[model samples]
Target: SALRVGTDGIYPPHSFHAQDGRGELTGFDIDLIKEVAHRLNLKVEFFETAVSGLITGLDTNRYDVLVNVAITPERQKKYDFSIPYIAHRVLLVVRSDQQDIRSFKDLTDKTVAQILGTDLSRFAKELKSHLVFSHNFEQSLQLLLSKRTDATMIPDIPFFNFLERRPHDGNLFKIADRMKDNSAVAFMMRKGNNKLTRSINEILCAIHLDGTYKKIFDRYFDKNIISSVPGCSS
Candidate 1:
């Protein structure tokens, strides 16, 4: 069967619109999935939508798989997952001009721009940082840029892509200490799709074993992001 895939295209360095606008899709997930389909001998089609809509699209079988998904127990109850392809290390980002902030404790008594409903939101709350929740990275980033918030936490990989695309802005922000939220990036499909699920896992294993996975990782990130992971092989 032709493989139909869905992605939110909101996250960068993973799955997002090329040229930072609509039309062609680009990023690590898009390229990696294309390779997976190639090796599986399946023709593929891509669809972009909102992150909130990804699951409903899968439940409706609108797509065979959704890319750039985090394998969480909550999601596992509703869908099957391929073995992880990436580990997301959350990074605290502060404007480059700010030097007083160095760790989570530094957020104390400060207003933070955080993505609503993400682990960072809870993290920020626990630190006693005043929370200003936004829906996506773009929103959070804007808030930080405008000096409305002290800082924001974001996935390191996508932030790498952000810096790559906006080279001159590299000095605009500095990534602070890394925070882990126990999330691993994977692909998802509707529940009980065992055959397809296993097949996808096998392809992921092969890619890692044969070095294709590392190649993809290198293309988007400066260093290895998968092999060093506990459950991820390379």
Candidate 2:
């Protein structure tokens, strides 16, 4: 059997093409799903696509599952989600020397760099911040670094992953306190695929028990962001 996985290959640390060596797909989510497939005795076939197209692809059976999807109520109603493998929080990132903006509330009348149509972008809009839309996370950070925007709201993991690959960038940015919108990250599949969903959920728990999850997590993140696994007691 084979697991066909769909992902946004441009989202760094989650799923992206390697900078070197044939530009093969590689990232935390990529590794994790590959591991899951390995344990299931299944080969993996990856399909790279735009974020907006992931759900449509899944519905049309383009893939068996979509990785790095946030588990939301709206999505839950339409698709089956594997037990969350990670927890993520939205972060307000500002230049290191920034002082005027300390939290989401401070964004009024300021310009924020965000991916258009994302939750973060909507939140920035609700805060009255003018939006400078970017195509991806890297661009959002670049917009901030170039002082083209006052700040950017991004998930904590990708922000840390960016800094992990370029430590010097840490000196140029900081995540604001009191700026968080926590969400569970999971794999999404077509609704009623109970057997596959159960198998994935079980594998997720097994990986946590055997420490495979931690090992893969440390390769991409500096800290342990997974406080709990949904079906795993530990």
Candidate 3:
């Protein structure tokens, strides 16, 4: 059997088309899911789509699982999630030259770039920041870089990956503290698929113990944030 994985090929370092390769899909999430399927003795298949469509596709049976989905109570009511593979903290990022916005509290009355329907977007709304919607993280940063938006909130891993890939861009800077929206990311599956969820969860715990998890994580992220996951050691 094959595990059909749904993902957005736009979130770099997590899932995205390789920049140097032949535009093939690659990232930490892609690598991790492939390993999970291999350990389960199942073939892996991927369906790339817009981030907004991932949950709907899973609900409609277009795919068997979704990668990089952050676990939330609202989503949990409809879909089953594997044990968290990683934890993410939201970050407030602005242009390196910015001096006025010092923290999340400074966002009020500011124009912030956000991806619609994401937790960050909701947080931006709560902060009373006027929002400029973008299609993905790259575009959100682009809006900030172009000064079209005053700031953008992003997950730490992707923000770190951006800095790693473009060390000289030096145009963006994340605020000193992470936001309150910390979340655990996991594979999402259709409700009632308890068997597959259990299988993936077991594989996740095994990989964390056997060092496979750290290997893939270190390939994309420089920090040892895996300890944030409940059962994983850094």
Candidate 4:
């Protein structure tokens, strides 16, 4: 099964348009995909797609690959995945000047903006009954900047990267606590694509063994960001 991947076309430094205004896609994932394509000797095709419609698109055969989906029980029932390429962790970001923020219990009943239906959102719903949900990360960030939410929940890598890039946001925030330790980020295929699944997994195993996987991952994520993960026995 040769992969035909679908990703949000504009996500920066991860899966975005190639430099020089080329129509081709490029980024860490793109680089990783190319590595797999070459390894498998299969033609890989990518589509510039909206994240909002990605799950539906996969369901309809509008696309055959899903690279940005977060794994969960609900999704596992609907699709198949290759080995995870990344992990996501939530942060409790706050203004640097902010004080008395000690832990998750501190934020109880506080309006917190998290991307709806994401890992963070699920965490909020499970931990406290009243945490607010936002439609996207940007919206949640904005809500915090404008003092709408007490704090925002962002995955650590992306949030720290964002603050580093901004540098002048006046007061910056930090993680209250890592709500859930980490969740594997994997590429998904339409259910029952066994041949393609075998092909992708083989390439991934090779990548892992030869160190291509770490190189591709480090291109976007900081090398020191690796966390102690559990239960990846396969």
Task: Give the number of the best model, judged by lDDT.
Answer: 2
Which one wins by lDDT: 2 or 3?
2
Best by TM-score: 3
The segments of candidate 3 whose C-alpha lies over 4 angstroms from its true place after superposition are 19-21, 224-234
lDDT tens per residue, model 3, 15-40:
87875645888999999999999999
After superposition on all CA atoms, how large is the RMSD of candidate 4?
A: 3.8
**Candidate 3: lDDT over CA atoms?**
0.84
Spell out the clash pairs found in candidate 1. none
* Model 2 Cα shift for residue 130 (angstroms): 2.1
Q: Give each model a TM-score.
A: 0.79, 0.87, 0.89, 0.78
Winner on TM-score (2 vs 4): 2
Candidate 3: worst-modelled 10 consecutive residues by lDDT: 225-234
Q: How much is the lDDT of residue 106 in candidate 1?
A: 92
Rank list by TM-score:
3, 2, 1, 4
Question: Residue 127 in candidate 4 has what lDDT?
Answer: 64
RMSD of each: 3.4, 2.5, 2.5, 3.8
- Please write out the lDDT profile of model 1 over residues 1-234, one tens digit for every residue: 588998877777677776647558777889999999998999889877666567788888888898877677888887888888877777889998987899888998888988655556878899899999786787788899999997988877767677777889988999876764646888888888899888888888888888887788788777644333433455
Give candidate 4's whole-model lDDT.
Answer: 0.70
